[PDB]
Amino acid sequence: MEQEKVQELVSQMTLDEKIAQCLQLSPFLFKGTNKNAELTGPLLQEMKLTDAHTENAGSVLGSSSALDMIGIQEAYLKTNRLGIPLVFMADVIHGYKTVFPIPLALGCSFDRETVRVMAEVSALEATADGHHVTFSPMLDLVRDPRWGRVMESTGEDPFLNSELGKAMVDGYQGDASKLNENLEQMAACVKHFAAYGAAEAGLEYNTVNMSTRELYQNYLPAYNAAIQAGAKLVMTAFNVVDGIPATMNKWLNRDVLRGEMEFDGVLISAWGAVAEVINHGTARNPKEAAQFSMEAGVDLEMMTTCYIHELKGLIEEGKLSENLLDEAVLRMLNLKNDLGLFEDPYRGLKNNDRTKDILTDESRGKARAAGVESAVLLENKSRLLPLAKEAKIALVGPLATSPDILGGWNVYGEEKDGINVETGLREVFETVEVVSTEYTELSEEDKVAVKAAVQNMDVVVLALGEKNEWGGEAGSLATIRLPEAQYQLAKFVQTLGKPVVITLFNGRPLEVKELAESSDALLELWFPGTEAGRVTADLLSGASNPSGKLSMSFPQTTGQIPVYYNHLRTGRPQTPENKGERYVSHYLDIPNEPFYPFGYGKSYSEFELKTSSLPKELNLGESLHVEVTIKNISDIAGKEVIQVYLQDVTASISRPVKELKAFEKVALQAGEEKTVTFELTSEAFSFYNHQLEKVQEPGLHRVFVGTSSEDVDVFEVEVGGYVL
Amino acid sequence: MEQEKVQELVSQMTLDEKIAQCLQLSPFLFKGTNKNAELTGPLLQEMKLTDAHTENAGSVLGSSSALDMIGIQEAYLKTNRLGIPLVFMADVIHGYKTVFPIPLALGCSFDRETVRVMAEVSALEATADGHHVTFSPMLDLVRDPRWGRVMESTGEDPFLNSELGKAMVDGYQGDASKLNENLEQMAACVKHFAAYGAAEAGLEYNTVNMSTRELYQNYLPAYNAAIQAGAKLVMTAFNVVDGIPATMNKWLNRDVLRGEMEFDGVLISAWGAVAEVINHGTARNPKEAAQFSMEAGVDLEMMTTCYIHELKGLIEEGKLSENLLDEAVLRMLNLKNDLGLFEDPYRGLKNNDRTKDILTDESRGKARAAGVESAVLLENKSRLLPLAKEAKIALVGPLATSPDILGGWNVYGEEKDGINVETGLREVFETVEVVSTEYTELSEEDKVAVKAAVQNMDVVVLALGEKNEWGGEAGSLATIRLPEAQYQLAKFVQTLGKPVVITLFNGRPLEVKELAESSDALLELWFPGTEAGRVTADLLSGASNPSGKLSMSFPQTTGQIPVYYNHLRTGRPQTPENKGERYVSHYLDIPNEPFYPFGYGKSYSEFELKTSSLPKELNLGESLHVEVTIKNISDIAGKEVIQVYLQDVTASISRPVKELKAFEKVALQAGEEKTVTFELTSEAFSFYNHQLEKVQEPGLHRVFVGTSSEDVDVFEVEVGGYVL
Ligand SMILES: OC[C@H]1O[C@@H](O[C@@H]2[C@@H](O)[C@@H](O)O[C@H](CO)[C@H]2O)[C@H](O)[C@@H](O)[C@@H]1O
Ligand SMILES: OC[C@H]1O[C@@H](O[C@@H]2[C@@H](O)[C@@H](O)O[C@H](CO)[C@H]2O)[C@H](O)[C@@H](O)[C@@H]1O
Ligand SMILES: [Mg+2]
Ligand SMILES: [Mg+2]
């Protein structure tokens, strides 16, 4: 409808109506739900909610199906005075019913189109079940694999994170200004604003602290890119940002998000984060929490009651302007209008059962493709892999048969539709002997049984991994290791004298040195989603050629953390030339380098890269154009990820030794050659100075072109002169 | 001499003379050195130093003896044009020849007077060997025991650090205005300005980052307190502060140190730190390094040649004002004048050989007392300790006979003067059987010898620890554990059936769970210094009663780091009454609490405390007066450390759950009772806000009185009303 009609609605609502429009509730707090109605009575009572509240609530969180939605919306519109339909929101993080790889695995793809397609398929299905908004992309930079929520990030690089964030937004939303017509796309909600990934000691919800400059330099750019690409909502973070919980942090959310980033959509709280500012010790009570969170421009309180119980008295007493409440309501109604909910509150479902669009074969194929793009081949000694279809396989370990391959933050997908490792292998390989073992134990009887199966077969597929419940939210591990039993199983299998491939499933970097040394090949599958066993079987047999690169550094040991490729030099760097001197930046007991670096991943193919003549000089404001010719010089078709890094040699702030500024994943048949070109704009050369100005300084930059952060040729470009 | 004549000298100096005044060199770069003379010509050549440079150099670093100093100063003064004597500086960190406990252990003393005495003795001896300045106190706050330099800090609390920092300055300097007269005291140099102990991942020289607010709130207060107490010099830090190496950080050194903190003494670079800004990437070359470091107010370049080769041209070209140089020179000359060098350049040594004053019996008794104050009794199950003097002792492990008990940063003390554990124990106990093992091995042959000795005796003194070389500078350990052979040894010894005391020697918190669980008692001796074997024997026999408390938390495991007592609450705190629940701040694999907390330590005595009646309300600006009555209710004389904490329940920044604001260590005879009183000024109630104002807000505080950060009674005071 026309904007005048939306503004009119605001004018006509009562104060009590405007307040309740700022509340989101679980579906079973509403009449007309068709699941968990036994939770409704006691929980309404604990939260002290009445019909006056629920019949005017702004939003529903986590509907269970199209029918839940339809029934809830229908009963709500019988009783709502002005006819304002509910907006339905959900967590569609890496797939709805067709589950794609976890975001961190999608980071390792380095493939923007894989990510867009995952987001498109997710929206297709999620809209078919009545959801209007997804709480994705998660854009928290991560340098600390202790934190369970690394699985939801695309990793340690702001540039990569930004680029894949934009891809996800584009895939979920399509053309943002036509969400009232394109009812198979949905609104995206960027989360968690801001810097939640920097949780101290990797502990869930724990203190975050960095300088404002570092916040701008590394922690904000990805949210920003997703905002500028049209993300409709933003969600606040749990953590403090320079001492103030992000939810009530006025500077953060008004000055930065709404001012600098020019965000003018719904700011929704993370779950309970409005009330939790009390726990943080920056509000005395719910009256202060409500006031501070509304001052900071939070429009929508997720499942707590500070707003509904306290805004009236605040406004009546004049501690809080009613204009701020009106601004919040207007953003909520604009969101609804942007989804076409005032013409069609059932968003395409009312006379159109779209069951047919859910978990199709086309969709499963895309997830399989996603899975094969995201896996990272870490070791392959002796060209053990690809295995031949007639190789006789002993498939052993906790991930041989486990149905737990869909990943954390799989709110809607079902393990029964998933393909386990065994089932995946038996479609491809004629001889497989299996010995399942438990995640945390290694018994004598297991060893006997493993030994018998290995004696029978020619190669071992050792499937190790985490349960998903060991990560995700509030799955923090102080020591980033598999259970010791799995390391002991890898040690045992090694003694059996047969070649070993380890297929590792997990949601975080782990200490894998012991696994690499106990096997001939090591394939990092992360959690691939619905098609996990086929992803695995196609990569092992070579029907697919691994092409993933690490988007997060794998530490030598827990105590190396944080370790990341874009690090400062320090005043006493170790060099190949001073190696072994005492008075340099090193550890006595491990290497400075991570076990595996950002951008690292093997292939069954071999590539050669050639960079065309770069200029020796560039003007300020001028783009650098990088042309690179890649050739597949092997007999095996495959894909390589070309990466370009920039370094600022001398600057008014100590700058990272490299930063990624471009990447493209290039597909090449055996003997095929391509030229790809990159533009590094002058923004790729700029950074935040100690005055928090985004600046370009004249001087020397090095440019690194290659296939990891370590495998690069280096070039020098001197920036100076005039500007543009 | 009169201030007018100090000025006169500056006018009288040539540009080349003023430049060289800002250079510090090792003793063997000067003519007249009585040691390492063979190094002179080559290093001179490598640094491109001439006679004109060395003959006008400002300062000597690390003189080897009184005769080095005398010889150097005597030759220097025969050729110096204007008669400006050299100032001699040294690393006297926890003792000169009489070595006291490492500073972290002195931290565990909670004893201001012990700290002042260490410093007074240190100056007594150092001045006797011709040193004018010590590079102490080190006041870097530490939360990361991976960093080897934690041994030099007094720990994780800024208040303790502030308080003991003041004590060391007083002990070294006495009355600062009379350093020209009191030739047995010396100048203190506060180090390292600033925030060096926050090195990322505990890696030496590594990136530091935190918000400016946190810099002010936690990282600056102890340097400030030492400066206000009259510290004569300050030394720069190796690390970046917010992206800019401290040594050239104008904001840090002019605005904060010289401006806010009103420091008007010599600012000396850490070793090479001027040249190292090039390595950091914030200067292109030694001309830029010199210019920026002089801009930042660094007066004295330690053993690099940026100033000496670059200032002239910088001043000639007009890129730098000669006034900044004149100011650096005046500060150097004023420090010499404060030390009396213009009347007596030999600072009391010339016709008075003070060999008599070094390593006296009186001094050794003070170092032993310091060791007994500083040790921390962590476990004592079932009154194993004190041992009766007729107890038959199996003394086993790497620290049984090791002479490595003086600690890191022992530049001048000699192991030959130290007392090892066996020698100590044999002065007190009649029967000791000794089996020495290696630091990093546990052989079958050791196990047989250990077993034979334990079967012979009644009790096991298991002496474990670190070589000092595994810490101190550039002694960074990714995993904070002893060698695994020592943990194995503690497991083996436990199986032998006999009570075990573990006496642990080290320079950092370690993972000690496995030691506590494998023994009956556990005594943390750190590195006590010269009298270590007697410190240990007296604590074990009960001739001295353990009284130290932990000044740094001992983590459950490496991956818990940083863990510290003054932590934020977060938005989802684990409570007693939600424990077990998933969605709270916790780890899946360890407790939140450190294995041992700040302020914790046992005693052979038992004490009772009761806090006199506190007010319910206080005005802003008003002090809180806290009266505590302590009774020793055992038959054993000893000391308790009374500790007072404050918490700010609600603030405009999320405030720590506790902060230490007072402490006093009370000596009590069996049955003795004493009353102590504390004043917490309105400043204890104040913090830095998000605009970086030092502020006091009305509201609730809790006051905790007790004998650890955990063993406390709690009281509430509501601050409001008007201001005093
Ligand atoms: O789910 C929406 C939003 O909130 C958080 O999930 C919450 C979790 O914090 C806790 O409240 O448990 C409830 C159980 O339903 C979850 O909904 C997530 O941190 C956030 O990412 C998510 O988008
Ligand atoms: O001792 C002077 C001063 O500088 C540093 O010590 C240096 C060390 O950095 C390295 O360069 O090696 C030389 C060996 O002589 C040391 O002097 C210390 O970090 C600092 O604390 C000390 O006060
Ligand atoms: Mg530059
Ligand atoms: Mg307060």
Side-chain angles (χ1 to χ4, degrees):
Chain A
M1 69 190 194
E2 294 309 354
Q3 197 60 32
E4 292 74 11
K5 304 225 157 282
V6 173
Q7 193 57 65
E8 157 174 276
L9 231 30
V10 179
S11 288
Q12 301 173 298
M13 293 164 88
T14 68
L15 186 62
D16 281 341
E17 285 166 338
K18 292 184 298 185
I19 293 174
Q21 188 65 203
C22 300
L23 177 70
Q24 183 181 70
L25 306 174
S26 280
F28 52 79
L29 293 167
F30 292 88
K31 191 160 70 69
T33 188
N34 72 338
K35 205 189 166 193
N36 296 129
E38 71 276 351
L39 298 180
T40 304
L43 184 72
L44 280 168
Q45 192 161 293
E46 159 191 325
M47 299 184 69
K48 287 98 61 35
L49 301 168
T50 64
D51 301 313
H53 297 138
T54 71
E55 298 177 352
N56 292 296
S59 179
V60 180
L61 167 89
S63 175
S64 65
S65 66
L67 259 47
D68 209 357
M69 183 275 203
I70 290 155
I72 281 167
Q73 186 73 298
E74 200 174 356
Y76 184 107
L77 294 172
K78 288 172 192 268
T79 61
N80 191 257
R81 182 176 72 80
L82 281 300
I84 309 161
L86 294 153
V87 58
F88 290 71
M89 314 201 190
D91 291 300
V92 196
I93 304 313
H94 58 111
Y96 191 69
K97 288 274 164 182
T98 309
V99 186
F100 284 69
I102 56 165
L104 189 50
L106 298 172
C108 297
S109 87
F110 281 70
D111 193 54
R112 286 163 185 98
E113 181 60 15
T114 295
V115 170
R116 195 202 62 82
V117 168
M118 178 281 291
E120 183 172 282
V121 165
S122 303
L124 174 80
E125 300 183 335
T127 55
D129 232 6
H131 307 291
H132 307 147
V133 182
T134 184
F135 304 122
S136 172
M138 181 284 199
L139 298 179
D140 311 329
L141 188 73
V142 291
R143 309 176 156 173
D144 191 345
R146 291 169 295 185
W147 193 49
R149 314 193 72 166
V150 293
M151 60 136 302
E152 291 164 69
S153 178
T154 61
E156 83 184 30
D157 186 60
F159 181 69
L160 187 62
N161 292 0
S162 296
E163 291 286 299
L164 304 174
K166 290 192 279 167
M168 277 199 220
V169 168
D170 182 45
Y172 289 128
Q173 295 193 163
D175 181 335
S177 72
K178 305 176 182 314
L179 279 161
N180 62 325
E181 312 170 359
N182 298 339
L183 308 186
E184 299 183 355
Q185 309 295 162
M186 70 200 307
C189 185
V190 171
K191 77 200 197 184
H192 300 86
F193 208 66
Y196 176 34
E200 189 162 273
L203 181 56
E204 195 61 82
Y205 321 109
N206 203 21
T207 303
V208 169
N209 188 262
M210 69 280 290
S211 73
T212 314
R213 192 191 43 68
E214 270 296 308
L215 179 68
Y216 277 82
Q217 188 59 57
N218 286 303
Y219 288 82
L220 299 177
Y223 315 111
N224 182 67
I227 294 154
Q228 304 324 325
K232 285 284 186 186
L233 299 77
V234 178
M235 180 193 293
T236 67
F238 292 116
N239 49 290
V240 296
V241 165
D242 201 1
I244 306 306
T247 297
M248 59 164 280
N249 184 328
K250 322 208 202 287
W251 170 75
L252 186 66
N253 296 329
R254 294 283 187 187
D255 297 351
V256 180
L257 178 64
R258 292 203 198 277
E260 294 171 6
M261 283 178 197
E262 306 186 11
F263 181 68
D264 184 48
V266 174
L267 181 57
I268 186 174
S269 84
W271 181 296
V274 167
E276 290 169 11
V277 304
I278 295 155
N279 298 332
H280 267 290
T282 66
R284 204 171 183 156
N285 52 45
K287 176 196 217 160
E288 290 192 349
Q291 187 190 330
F292 303 155
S293 301
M294 180 63 77
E295 279 168 351
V298 171
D299 300 324
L300 187 52
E301 184 173 2
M302 181 183 288
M303 270 301 276
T304 42
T305 57
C306 301
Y307 283 179
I308 41 139
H309 295 320
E310 305 286 346
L311 287 182
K312 162 157 282 180
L314 281 171
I315 289 171
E316 271 169 7
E317 298 161 16
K319 305 179 147 94
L320 224 224
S321 179
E322 190 169 344
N323 298 314
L324 299 182
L325 175 63
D326 288 1
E327 286 160 31
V329 167
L330 179 55
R331 295 190 284 268
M332 282 291 296
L333 309 180
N334 282 333
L335 172 54
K336 279 161 183 198
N337 200 39
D338 290 348
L339 302 161
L341 293 188
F342 294 106
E343 291 76 40
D344 183 9
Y346 301 100
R347 201 141 190 282
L349 296 197
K350 187 50 170 192
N351 311 114
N352 188 20
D353 183 307
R354 303 181 45 209
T355 300
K356 53 153 264 173
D357 292 353
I358 294 173
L359 198 57
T360 69
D361 286 348
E362 197 188 346
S363 286
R364 300 187 68 124
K366 293 157 173 182
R368 192 170 173 175
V372 310
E373 295 286 336
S374 297
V376 188
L377 184 69
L378 292 174
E379 304 289 349
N380 184 24
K381 306 183 197 138
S382 316
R383 314 188 138 76
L384 179 57
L385 295 182
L387 311 174
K389 281 195 78 181
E390 67 266 34
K392 299 179 52 172
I393 299 178
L395 173 62
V396 317
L399 268 287
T401 67
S402 184
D404 188 5
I405 41 71
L406 301 179
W409 274 116
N410 167 33
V411 177
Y412 295 95
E414 282 167 285
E415 284 183 355
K416 73 177 171 57
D417 306 329
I419 312 302
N420 75 354
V421 176
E422 167 170 19
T423 298
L425 295 194
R426 296 188 182 282
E427 302 182 340
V428 170
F429 294 98
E430 43 183 7
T431 318
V432 193
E433 186 168 348
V434 186
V435 187
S436 184
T437 61
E438 327 244 60
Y439 281 85
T440 71
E441 301 291 4
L442 179 63
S443 70
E444 299 307 305
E445 174 189 340
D446 289 332
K447 286 161 149 188
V448 167
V450 166
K451 181 182 191 151
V454 183
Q455 268 163 203
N456 299 339
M457 304 284 99
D458 304 327
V459 298
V460 190
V461 182
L462 180 53
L464 302 180
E466 302 188 294
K467 294 189 165 131
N468 82 73
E469 79 185 32
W470 300 339
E473 184 178 348
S476 289
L477 283 185
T479 300
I480 60 156
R481 285 176 70 81
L482 298 175
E484 194 52 22
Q486 291 189 41
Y487 290 103
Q488 299 157 351
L489 174 54
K491 186 175 104 199
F492 178 74
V493 165
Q494 198 279 332
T495 74
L496 305 177
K498 300 280 171 97
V500 182
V501 185
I502 283 168
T503 46
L504 178 73
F505 301 77
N506 46 310
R508 53 160 58 79
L510 291 159
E511 291 183 14
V512 310
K513 174 176 165 134
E514 281 156 49
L515 302 176
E517 291 181 347
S518 291
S519 64
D520 303 286
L522 168 67
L523 183 65
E524 171 66 279
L525 284 310
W526 303 104
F527 289 130
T530 288
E531 298 283 299
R534 295 175 178 148
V535 176
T536 306
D538 300 347
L539 287 165
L540 291 177
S541 75
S544 300
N545 185 0
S547 72
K549 309 290 208 174
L550 292 177
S551 70
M552 197 171 187
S553 297
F554 273 44
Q556 298 273 349
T557 192
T558 294
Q560 194 174 51
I561 293 168
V563 58
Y564 53 86
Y565 85 96
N566 58 333
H567 59 82
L568 302 199
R569 193 133 187 280
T570 91
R572 292 174 170 195
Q574 54 154 49
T575 62
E577 306 77 68
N578 63 27
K579 258 288 270 268
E581 280 182 21
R582 172 76 183 213
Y583 291 94
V584 305
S585 181
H586 75 294
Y587 292 105
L588 301 174
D589 60 333
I590 59 167
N592 290 20
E593 292 79 15
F595 192 70
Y596 297 128
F598 177 85
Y600 169 75
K602 299 173 71 60
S603 178
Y604 305 148
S605 313
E606 257 208 295
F607 302 93
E608 72 187 341
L609 270 65
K610 175 56 169 198
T611 299
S612 311
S613 215
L614 297 157
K616 213 299 98 104
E617 295 191 303
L618 222 53
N619 291 123
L620 290 152
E622 189 175 7
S623 295
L624 177 73
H625 288 280
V626 181
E627 186 182 61
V628 176
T629 296
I630 184 165
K631 179 163 207 223
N632 181 348
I633 58 160
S634 82
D635 296 318
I636 294 141
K639 312 180 173 205
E640 186 54 276
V641 183
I642 300 165
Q643 302 147 61
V644 187
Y645 300 82
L646 254 204
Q647 169 185 31
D648 192 346
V649 176
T650 315
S652 59
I653 294 298
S654 183
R655 296 273 298 129
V657 295
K658 304 179 152 62
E659 293 173 313
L660 188 71
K661 312 278 174 192
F663 67 90
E664 198 204 312
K665 184 167 227 193
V666 173
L668 296 170
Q669 292 301 296
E672 185 178 11
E673 180 173 280
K674 298 183 174 166
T675 292
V676 279
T677 60
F678 304 99
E679 186 185 9
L680 308 194
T681 64
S682 65
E683 208 284 341
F685 291 85
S686 301
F687 67 99
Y688 293 90
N689 74 14
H690 89 288
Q691 204 134 344
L692 311 166
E693 299 164 337
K694 187 70 158 289
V695 320
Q696 198 185 0
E697 281 171 1
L700 184 66
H701 293 256
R702 291 180 190 112
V703 178
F704 311 84
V705 179
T707 53
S708 84
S709 60
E710 292 292 311
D711 304 330
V712 294
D713 295 318
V714 62
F715 305 104
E716 295 194 351
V717 186
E718 192 65 43
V719 191
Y722 58 85
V723 183
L724 260 22
Chain B
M1 80 187 189
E2 309 286 31
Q3 200 54 51
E4 294 83 45
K5 287 163 278 169
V6 181
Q7 207 58 66
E8 189 194 323
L9 221 45
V10 178
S11 316
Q12 289 181 339
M13 292 170 85
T14 66
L15 187 53
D16 282 3
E17 288 174 340
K18 288 180 298 179
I19 294 172
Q21 186 66 197
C22 303
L23 174 73
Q24 187 185 63
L25 307 174
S26 287
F28 53 77
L29 297 168
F30 299 89
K31 168 187 179 69
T33 187
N34 81 328
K35 187 173 155 166
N36 294 302
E38 82 271 7
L39 306 186
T40 303
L43 187 57
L44 279 166
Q45 282 187 26
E46 181 191 307
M47 301 178 71
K48 276 135 270 307
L49 297 173
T50 66
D51 292 329
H53 297 138
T54 64
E55 294 174 1
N56 293 295
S59 175
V60 178
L61 171 95
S63 173
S64 63
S65 72
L67 315 126
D68 213 359
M69 183 272 151
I70 286 154
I72 284 165
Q73 184 71 293
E74 165 167 34
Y76 186 99
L77 282 170
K78 60 162 179 46
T79 60
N80 196 253
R81 191 174 62 95
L82 288 174
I84 308 174
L86 286 160
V87 61
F88 287 73
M89 308 206 190
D91 286 300
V92 196
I93 305 311
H94 55 112
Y96 192 68
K97 291 276 170 179
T98 303
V99 180
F100 286 70
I102 55 177
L104 190 47
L106 294 180
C108 300
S109 82
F110 280 73
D111 201 48
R112 291 161 181 92
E113 176 66 8
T114 294
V115 173
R116 189 198 64 78
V117 169
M118 177 281 298
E120 176 176 280
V121 166
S122 303
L124 167 75
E125 302 190 337
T127 59
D129 232 3
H131 309 296
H132 310 146
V133 183
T134 186
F135 296 133
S136 170
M138 179 278 204
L139 296 176
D140 307 332
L141 188 81
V142 294
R143 303 186 161 165
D144 191 345
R146 290 171 287 193
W147 195 50
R149 311 196 74 159
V150 297
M151 55 136 303
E152 293 161 69
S153 179
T154 60
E156 88 194 26
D157 185 58
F159 184 71
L160 185 56
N161 291 357
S162 294
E163 291 290 286
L164 302 183
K166 284 198 277 157
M168 281 200 207
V169 173
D170 180 60
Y172 288 130
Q173 295 193 166
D175 174 343
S177 74
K178 287 153 201 292
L179 280 167
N180 59 333
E181 291 180 355
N182 297 330
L183 311 192
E184 300 187 3
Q185 275 89 25
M186 69 200 301
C189 183
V190 165
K191 73 200 201 177
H192 306 79
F193 200 79
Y196 181 35
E200 186 159 285
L203 182 61
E204 195 59 82
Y205 315 118
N206 201 22
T207 302
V208 169
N209 193 251
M210 72 275 291
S211 73
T212 307
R213 191 189 45 73
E214 271 296 301
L215 182 62
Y216 273 93
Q217 184 67 46
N218 293 309
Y219 284 87
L220 293 176
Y223 314 114
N224 184 58
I227 289 155
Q228 304 321 322
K232 284 287 183 185
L233 292 80
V234 177
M235 177 192 294
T236 65
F238 294 112
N239 53 285
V240 295
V241 162
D242 200 8
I244 305 186
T247 303
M248 58 163 274
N249 182 325
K250 323 190 29 179
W251 173 74
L252 178 74
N253 297 328
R254 301 282 189 181
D255 296 330
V256 176
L257 175 64
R258 293 205 193 271
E260 300 178 359
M261 285 180 193
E262 306 192 331
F263 181 61
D264 192 42
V266 172
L267 178 62
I268 189 175
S269 88
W271 185 297
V274 166
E276 288 169 16
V277 308
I278 299 149
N279 293 331
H280 273 285
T282 60
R284 194 194 263 251
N285 59 31
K287 179 189 211 153
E288 281 192 6
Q291 178 190 330
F292 303 153
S293 303
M294 178 62 72
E295 282 169 351
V298 171
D299 301 322
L300 187 56
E301 180 175 7
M302 177 185 297
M303 273 292 283
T304 45
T305 61
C306 298
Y307 280 179
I308 243 273
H309 297 320
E310 305 289 340
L311 290 183
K312 151 152 280 182
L314 282 165
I315 288 172
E316 278 173 2
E317 275 142 58
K319 295 155 174 60
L320 226 215
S321 170
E322 195 163 347
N323 295 320
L324 301 191
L325 174 53
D326 288 355
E327 291 163 27
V329 173
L330 188 51
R331 289 194 287 272
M332 283 287 297
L333 265 33
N334 276 323
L335 162 67
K336 294 171 169 185
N337 201 37
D338 292 342
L339 293 158
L341 296 182
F342 290 109
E343 290 75 48
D344 187 5
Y346 302 100
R347 194 138 196 279
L349 297 203
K350 225 314 101 95
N351 296 108
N352 180 2
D353 164 25
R354 299 180 46 212
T355 302
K356 333 277 68 219
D357 296 5
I358 296 176
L359 200 56
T360 62
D361 283 5
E362 197 193 343
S363 289
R364 294 184 74 120
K366 295 164 159 154
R368 185 205 300 214
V372 308
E373 290 285 316
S374 290
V376 186
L377 179 70
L378 290 178
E379 303 290 347
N380 186 19
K381 302 172 221 163
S382 89
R383 317 297 243 242
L384 176 48
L385 301 170
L387 304 177
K389 288 187 65 173
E390 57 285 356
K392 277 141 51 50
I393 297 177
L395 167 64
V396 327
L399 269 292
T401 61
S402 175
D404 193 6
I405 44 65
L406 303 185
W409 278 111
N410 170 32
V411 182
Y412 294 95
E414 320 184 46
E415 293 191 345
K416 84 167 149 56
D417 301 314
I419 306 300
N420 73 357
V421 176
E422 177 180 11
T423 300
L425 288 201
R426 289 195 188 286
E427 298 183 341
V428 170
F429 298 98
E430 51 201 3
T431 312
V432 190
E433 232 185 281
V434 181
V435 188
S436 200
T437 58
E438 313 289 352
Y439 281 84
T440 66
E441 308 288 1
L442 177 62
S443 69
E444 291 311 305
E445 189 185 356
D446 290 338
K447 290 172 128 183
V448 172
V450 168
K451 169 152 193 157
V454 182
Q455 277 164 348
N456 284 352
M457 303 282 93
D458 299 332
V459 284
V460 194
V461 179
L462 184 52
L464 302 181
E466 297 189 293
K467 294 191 171 138
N468 81 73
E469 78 188 54
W470 301 337
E473 185 179 349
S476 284
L477 283 183
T479 306
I480 51 153
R481 291 175 64 79
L482 294 178
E484 186 62 26
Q486 295 192 42
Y487 290 106
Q488 293 162 347
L489 174 57
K491 196 205 282 104
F492 176 69
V493 163
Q494 199 274 322
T495 71
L496 303 183
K498 299 297 171 73
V500 183
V501 184
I502 286 171
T503 53
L504 183 67
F505 296 79
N506 50 307
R508 53 159 58 80
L510 296 160
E511 290 188 10
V512 305
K513 180 168 161 134
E514 284 155 49
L515 306 179
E517 285 178 2
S518 294
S519 64
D520 299 291
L522 173 69
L523 181 67
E524 172 57 282
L525 289 143
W526 304 105
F527 289 131
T530 292
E531 294 281 297
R534 314 196 162 118
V535 172
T536 307
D538 299 345
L539 287 164
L540 290 179
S541 70
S544 297
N545 186 1
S547 67
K549 310 288 204 168
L550 285 182
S551 72
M552 191 169 195
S553 317
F554 274 44
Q556 298 281 357
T557 191
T558 289
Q560 196 173 53
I561 292 167
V563 56
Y564 51 85
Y565 89 90
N566 56 338
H567 64 84
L568 305 196
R569 187 142 204 270
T570 90
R572 291 175 175 198
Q574 199 183 56
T575 66
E577 41 281 318
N578 64 26
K579 213 157 174 270
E581 292 173 35
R582 170 69 187 208
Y583 293 105
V584 304
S585 189
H586 78 292
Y587 291 104
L588 299 182
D589 56 332
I590 55 166
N592 288 14
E593 298 83 356
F595 189 74
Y596 294 126
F598 183 86
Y600 165 77
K602 299 180 67 81
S603 174
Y604 304 147
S605 300
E606 186 187 11
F607 299 95
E608 218 174 0
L609 287 66
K610 102 195 320 292
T611 288
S612 300
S613 199
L614 295 164
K616 253 244 146 285
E617 300 190 283
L618 225 50
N619 294 124
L620 293 146
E622 186 183 353
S623 290
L624 187 77
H625 282 283
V626 183
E627 188 178 53
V628 186
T629 302
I630 186 168
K631 187 171 214 308
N632 181 349
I633 63 183
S634 80
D635 301 316
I636 304 135
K639 313 184 183 183
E640 186 57 283
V641 185
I642 304 172
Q643 307 149 46
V644 185
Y645 299 83
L646 258 198
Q647 173 192 22
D648 187 346
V649 171
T650 312
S652 67
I653 293 292
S654 167
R655 299 272 296 117
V657 294
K658 305 181 152 65
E659 298 174 305
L660 190 69
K661 307 293 184 191
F663 68 91
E664 197 195 312
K665 174 169 225 183
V666 182
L668 295 170
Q669 292 296 294
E672 192 173 7
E673 168 179 296
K674 288 183 168 160
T675 292
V676 294
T677 65
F678 304 104
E679 185 189 357
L680 286 50
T681 66
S682 72
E683 204 192 19
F685 283 89
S686 301
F687 65 104
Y688 292 92
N689 74 5
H690 90 265
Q691 218 142 318
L692 305 158
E693 298 158 332
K694 188 78 154 305
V695 318
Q696 196 188 5
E697 300 178 344
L700 186 66
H701 291 247
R702 301 183 177 105
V703 181
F704 312 81
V705 187
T707 69
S708 80
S709 54
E710 289 293 324
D711 303 336
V712 299
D713 292 316
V714 55
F715 312 102
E716 291 187 352
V717 189
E718 187 69 39
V719 185
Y722 53 90
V723 192
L724 282 59

